[PDB]
Design a binder for this molecule. Structure first.
Ligand SMILES: NS(=O)(=O)c1c(F)c(F)c(S(=O)(=O)CCO)c(N[C@H](c2ccccc2)[C@@H](O)c2ccccc2)c1F
Ligand SMILES: [Zn+2]
Length: 257
């Protein structure tokens, strides 16, 4: 039922998922002056050299690229994390215009889009068990601004015409997610939640300070996707972001300054 429109969007999600009004909901505005530099935070370790992508799917909310996570390959650790987290999928959130689209904001600034690389804690054995845990997931968030093209994105962009509508999927092998990272791994971190139903409070968020640049043409291709299925009226997949939620009790920590 849920989606991103007037009658089913963010302001409605609490009826099916009352945690929507919980104490550790995401995204949030990152007030960069209030974030605490934490000298005890470790550099983030991103090891994606053996990542194995499997498919790409239009799920009617966004598109996912899912990875084979049955071996110890693409892993996030260090930073604020205890233990090892395995990459399972990435997706994006983006706007109808370049001035909105991100879920997190930085001093109220919205970016054109936001990339989420979703990892589960290997101590829980699989992602379905990990989402039931308060430290089950680590999501790496990367802002996108419009400027110069991101060459590492173009393989994604060029397959989107094959998954235009809800339910469509394709083969999507040998995609290297290292091509979506910025130069710097400096980050903010805080405890939060999934930003889509079921909104589980299971995520350690790690948001990189440095955005990647993508071209205007690359993001225009995201905006040609459809929310609807094949043979329903066409509704462009745009503005699939949840707005910032109350920070409540929480402290955002910075790895830098
Ligand atoms: N922004 S976010 O990172 O919070 C987020 C999304 F915004 C998002 F769009 C997805 S999605 O799979 O692309 C479509 C909505 O379910 C998921 N996918 C969930 C997921 C995938 C892999 C491992 C854990 C969670 C979703 O598929 C899910 C939710 C709850 C329980 C199992 C799986 C997601 F986690
Ligand atoms: Zn997301």
């Amino acid at each position: 039922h849920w989606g991103y429109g007037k009658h089913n969007g963010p302001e409605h999600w609490h009826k099916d998922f009352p945690i929507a009004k919980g104490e550790r909901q995401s995204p949030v505005d990152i007030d960069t002056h209030t974030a605490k530099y934490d000298p005890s935070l470790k550099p983030l370790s991103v090891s994606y050299d053996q990542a194995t992508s499997l498919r790409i799917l239009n799920n009617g909310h966004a598109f996912n690229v899912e990875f084979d996570d049955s071996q110890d390959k693409a892993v996030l650790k260090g930073g604020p994390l205890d233990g090892t987290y395995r990459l399972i999928q990435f997706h994006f959130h983006w706007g109808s215009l370049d001035g909105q689209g991100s879920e997190h904001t930085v001093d109220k600034k919205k970016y054109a889009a936001e990339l989420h690389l979703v990892h589960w804690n290997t101590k829980y054995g699989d992602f379905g068990k990990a989402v039931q845990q308060p430290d089950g997931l680590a999501v790496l968030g990367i802002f996108l601004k419009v400027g110069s093209a991101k060459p590492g994105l173009q393989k994604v962009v060029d397959v989107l015409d094959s998954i235009k509508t809800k339910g469509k999927s394709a083969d999507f092998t040998n995609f290297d997610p290292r091509g979506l990272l910025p130069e710097s791994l400096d980050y903010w971190t805080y405890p939060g939640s999934l930003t889509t139903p079921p909104l589980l409070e299971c995520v350690t968020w790690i948001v990189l300070k440095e955005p990647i640049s993508v071209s205007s043409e690359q993001v225009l291709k995201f905006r040609k996707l459809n929310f609807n299925g094949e043979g329903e009226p066409e509704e462009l997949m745009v503005d699939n972001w949840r707005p910032a939620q109350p920070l409540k009790n929480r402290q955002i920590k910075a790895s830098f300054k």
